[PDB]
mmCIF file of all heavy atoms in Angstrom:
data_model
loop_
_atom_site.group_PDB
_atom_site.id
_atom_site.type_symbol
_atom_site.label_atom_id
_atom_site.label_comp_id
_atom_site.label_asym_id
_atom_site.label_seq_id
_atom_site.Cartn_x
_atom_site.Cartn_y
_atom_site.Cartn_z
ATOM 1 N N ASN A 897 -27.296 0.418 -8.524
ATOM 2 C CA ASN A 897 -27.469 1.891 -8.511
ATOM 3 C C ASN A 897 -27.155 2.429 -7.089
ATOM 4 O O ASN A 897 -27.831 2.066 -6.144
ATOM 5 C CB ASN A 897 -28.905 2.269 -8.948
ATOM 6 C CG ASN A 897 -29.115 3.763 -9.052
ATOM 7 O OD1 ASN A 897 -28.686 4.516 -8.206
ATOM 8 N ND2 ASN A 897 -29.839 4.201 -10.051
ATOM 9 N N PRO A 898 -26.161 3.329 -6.956
ATOM 10 C CA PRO A 898 -25.813 3.843 -5.626
ATOM 11 C C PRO A 898 -27.006 4.483 -4.979
ATOM 12 O O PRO A 898 -27.145 4.346 -3.722
ATOM 13 C CB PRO A 898 -24.702 4.877 -5.901
ATOM 14 C CG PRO A 898 -24.049 4.354 -7.171
ATOM 15 C CD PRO A 898 -25.245 3.833 -8.007
ATOM 16 N N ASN A 899 -27.850 5.194 -5.751
ATOM 17 C CA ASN A 899 -28.960 5.844 -5.067
ATOM 18 C C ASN A 899 -29.915 4.823 -4.439
ATOM 19 O O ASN A 899 -30.505 5.099 -3.408
ATOM 20 C CB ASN A 899 -29.793 6.734 -5.993
ATOM 21 C CG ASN A 899 -29.047 7.925 -6.502
ATOM 22 O OD1 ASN A 899 -27.936 8.234 -6.086
ATOM 23 N ND2 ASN A 899 -29.640 8.589 -7.477
ATOM 24 N N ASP A 900 -30.076 3.696 -5.102
ATOM 25 C CA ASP A 900 -31.002 2.643 -4.599
ATOM 26 C C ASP A 900 -30.457 2.064 -3.286
ATOM 27 O O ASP A 900 -31.171 1.916 -2.298
ATOM 28 C CB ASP A 900 -31.160 1.545 -5.633
ATOM 29 C CG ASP A 900 -32.025 1.956 -6.789
ATOM 30 O OD1 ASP A 900 -32.825 2.908 -6.650
ATOM 31 O OD2 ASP A 900 -31.917 1.288 -7.828
ATOM 32 N N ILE A 901 -29.176 1.703 -3.312
ATOM 33 C CA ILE A 901 -28.560 1.059 -2.177
ATOM 34 C C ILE A 901 -28.488 2.019 -0.989
ATOM 35 O O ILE A 901 -28.841 1.643 0.143
ATOM 36 C CB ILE A 901 -27.135 0.557 -2.545
ATOM 37 C CG1 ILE A 901 -27.209 -0.466 -3.677
ATOM 38 C CG2 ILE A 901 -26.418 -0.066 -1.301
ATOM 39 C CD1 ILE A 901 -25.882 -0.739 -4.366
ATOM 40 N N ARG A 902 -28.051 3.250 -1.222
ATOM 41 C CA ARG A 902 -28.028 4.234 -0.118
ATOM 42 C C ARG A 902 -29.428 4.498 0.421
ATOM 43 O O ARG A 902 -29.560 4.691 1.632
ATOM 44 C CB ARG A 902 -27.407 5.570 -0.597
ATOM 45 C CG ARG A 902 -25.902 5.453 -0.879
ATOM 46 C CD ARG A 902 -25.219 6.775 -1.265
ATOM 47 N NE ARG A 902 -25.643 7.293 -2.584
ATOM 48 C CZ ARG A 902 -24.824 7.529 -3.604
ATOM 49 N NH1 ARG A 902 -23.503 7.325 -3.499
ATOM 50 N NH2 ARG A 902 -25.360 8.027 -4.724
ATOM 51 N N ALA A 903 -30.451 4.517 -0.446
ATOM 52 C CA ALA A 903 -31.820 4.831 0.023
ATOM 53 C C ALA A 903 -32.333 3.730 0.968
ATOM 54 O O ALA A 903 -33.036 4.040 1.937
ATOM 55 C CB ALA A 903 -32.786 4.956 -1.180
ATOM 56 N N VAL A 904 -32.024 2.466 0.640
ATOM 57 C CA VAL A 904 -32.594 1.373 1.438
ATOM 58 C C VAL A 904 -31.910 1.309 2.789
ATOM 59 O O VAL A 904 -32.570 1.058 3.798
ATOM 60 C CB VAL A 904 -32.479 0.018 0.704
ATOM 61 C CG1 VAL A 904 -32.801 -1.166 1.639
ATOM 62 C CG2 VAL A 904 -33.410 0.030 -0.560
ATOM 63 N N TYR A 905 -30.621 1.591 2.839
ATOM 64 C CA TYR A 905 -29.883 1.257 4.065
ATOM 65 C C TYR A 905 -29.487 2.429 4.945
ATOM 66 O O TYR A 905 -29.508 2.280 6.169
ATOM 67 C CB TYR A 905 -28.607 0.436 3.725
ATOM 68 C CG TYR A 905 -28.972 -0.915 3.163
ATOM 69 C CD1 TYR A 905 -28.753 -1.214 1.810
ATOM 70 C CD2 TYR A 905 -29.597 -1.866 3.948
ATOM 71 C CE1 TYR A 905 -29.092 -2.429 1.291
ATOM 72 C CE2 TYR A 905 -29.944 -3.117 3.427
ATOM 73 C CZ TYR A 905 -29.692 -3.375 2.080
ATOM 74 O OH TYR A 905 -30.045 -4.578 1.562
ATOM 75 N N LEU A 906 -29.066 3.557 4.378
ATOM 76 C CA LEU A 906 -28.541 4.597 5.258
ATOM 77 C C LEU A 906 -29.585 5.184 6.201
ATOM 78 O O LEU A 906 -29.255 5.387 7.390
ATOM 79 C CB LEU A 906 -27.859 5.716 4.460
ATOM 80 C CG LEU A 906 -26.511 5.239 3.888
ATOM 81 C CD1 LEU A 906 -25.978 6.323 2.959
ATOM 82 C CD2 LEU A 906 -25.484 4.913 4.987
ATOM 83 N N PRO A 907 -30.821 5.453 5.770
ATOM 84 C CA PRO A 907 -31.741 6.060 6.771
ATOM 85 C C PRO A 907 -31.993 5.165 7.986
ATOM 86 O O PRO A 907 -32.052 5.625 9.134
ATOM 87 C CB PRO A 907 -33.033 6.274 5.949
ATOM 88 C CG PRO A 907 -32.482 6.538 4.525
ATOM 89 C CD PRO A 907 -31.438 5.426 4.411
ATOM 90 N N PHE A 908 -32.094 3.872 7.736
ATOM 91 C CA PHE A 908 -32.240 2.854 8.780
ATOM 92 C C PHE A 908 -31.089 2.924 9.779
ATOM 93 O O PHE A 908 -31.299 2.722 10.985
ATOM 94 C CB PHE A 908 -32.309 1.452 8.145
ATOM 95 C CG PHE A 908 -31.916 0.307 9.096
ATOM 96 C CD1 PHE A 908 -32.734 -0.068 10.154
ATOM 97 C CD2 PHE A 908 -30.714 -0.351 8.900
ATOM 98 C CE1 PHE A 908 -32.354 -1.138 10.980
ATOM 99 C CE2 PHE A 908 -30.338 -1.381 9.720
ATOM 100 C CZ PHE A 908 -31.159 -1.777 10.734
ATOM 101 N N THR A 909 -29.885 3.239 9.301
ATOM 102 C CA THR A 909 -28.759 3.245 10.244
ATOM 103 C C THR A 909 -28.860 4.405 11.260
ATOM 104 O O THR A 909 -28.144 4.411 12.267
ATOM 105 C CB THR A 909 -27.378 3.308 9.555
ATOM 106 O OG1 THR A 909 -27.185 4.561 8.889
ATOM 107 C CG2 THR A 909 -27.160 2.127 8.609
ATOM 108 N N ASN A 910 -29.792 5.318 11.079
ATOM 109 C CA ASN A 910 -30.015 6.394 12.052
ATOM 110 C C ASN A 910 -31.114 6.048 13.048
ATOM 111 O O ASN A 910 -31.501 6.877 13.888
ATOM 112 C CB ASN A 910 -30.352 7.719 11.331
ATOM 113 C CG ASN A 910 -29.176 8.236 10.548
ATOM 114 O OD1 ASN A 910 -28.093 8.437 11.091
ATOM 115 N ND2 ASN A 910 -29.348 8.357 9.250
ATOM 116 N N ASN A 911 -31.664 4.842 12.920
ATOM 117 C CA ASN A 911 -32.675 4.361 13.872
ATOM 118 C C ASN A 911 -31.965 3.931 15.155
ATOM 119 O O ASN A 911 -31.382 2.859 15.241
ATOM 120 C CB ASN A 911 -33.486 3.206 13.268
ATOM 121 C CG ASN A 911 -34.624 2.729 14.148
ATOM 122 O OD1 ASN A 911 -34.527 2.703 15.376
ATOM 123 N ND2 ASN A 911 -35.716 2.275 13.504
#
Side-chain angles (χ1 to χ4, degrees):
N897 184 317
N899 294 352
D900 285 339
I901 299 164
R902 291 184 292 239
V904 168
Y905 294 110
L906 287 173
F908 157 71
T909 67
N910 293 304
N911 185 324

